[PDB]
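Hey all, quick one. A colleague (J.T.) asked me to put the sodium ion job into the tracker so the inputs and the structure tokens live in one place instead of scattered across chat threads. No bug as far as I know, just bookkeeping. Sequence used:
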Amino acid sequence: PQITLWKRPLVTIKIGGQLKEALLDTGADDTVIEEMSLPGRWKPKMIGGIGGFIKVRQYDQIIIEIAGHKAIGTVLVGPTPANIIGRNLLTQIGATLNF
Amino acid sequence: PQITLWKRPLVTIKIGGQLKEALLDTGADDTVIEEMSLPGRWKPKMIGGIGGFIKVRQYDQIIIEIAGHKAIGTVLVGPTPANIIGRNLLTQIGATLNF
Ligand SMILES: COc1ccc(S(=O)(=O)N(C[C@H]2CCC(=O)N2)C[C@@H](O)[C@H](Cc2ccccc2)NC(=O)O[C@@H]2C[C@@H]3CCO[C@@H]3C2)cc1
Ligand SMILES: [Cl-]
Ligand SMILES: [Cl-]
Ligand SMILES: [Cl-]
Ligand SMILES: [Cl-]
Ligand SMILES: [Cl-]
Ligand SMILES: [Cl-]
Ligand SMILES: [Cl-]
Ligand SMILES: [Cl-]
Ligand code: NA
């Protein structure tokens, strides 16, 4: 699809067997999801943005379905105010910015 | 152009006669730039990012060149770790997200 940016670029994702809404976010290096459990091992990480840093759990090799496209990669889980699909997974579905 | 996301989508902007680098950020509603001087009056605004809320200065109707395209609109100035071009100006330059 092609998505204009008049509104937030929100899509449905499936992660951990759960359906969620998430922002397609070219300004995010990493994918960050609101608190939930994921299978497997994880390691702690700090990520920063406007407002400062938050502590997250880093899970590797997690599959997400992004608007019907499967991707695999690292997912950060923590007290983010929004679910964010970052560039590490956007590349996997071939997303580009065009102007 | 068409910009893939394997690297940060950084472009050159020109604002107040100064060249700067900024991130094209579909996850940002607003354009937020690092502290600098701008003409005119400003108004208060609070924005919420990943680490919490910050106060910024809202300057309206500021002329800003983005990757060679002219935009005129609202610019927020505050302690951001990076200059970010948000949807308010991405729509002016006609950007879309495609996959
Ligand atoms: C390490 O991987 C990550 C690191 C930081 C972030 S982030 O959420 O902090 N952010 C990073 C951006 C902003 C600073 C920078 O250099 N890149 C991604 C952003 O798209 C973020 C994503 C975001 C974070 C929190 C809430 C909503 C979206 N949006 C954002 O800060 O927008 C600001 C806050 C205001 C809310 C929406 O628009 C307004 C302007 C995401 C992944
Ligand atoms: Cl859960
Ligand atoms: Cl970070
Ligand atoms: Cl935290
Ligand atoms: Cl990854
Ligand atoms: Cl590619
Ligand atoms: Cl450029
Ligand atoms: Cl700069
Ligand atoms: Cl502040
Ligand atoms: Na894992």
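Adding what we noticed when we looked at it: Helices of chain A lie at 87-90. Chain A is about 5% helix and 55% strand.
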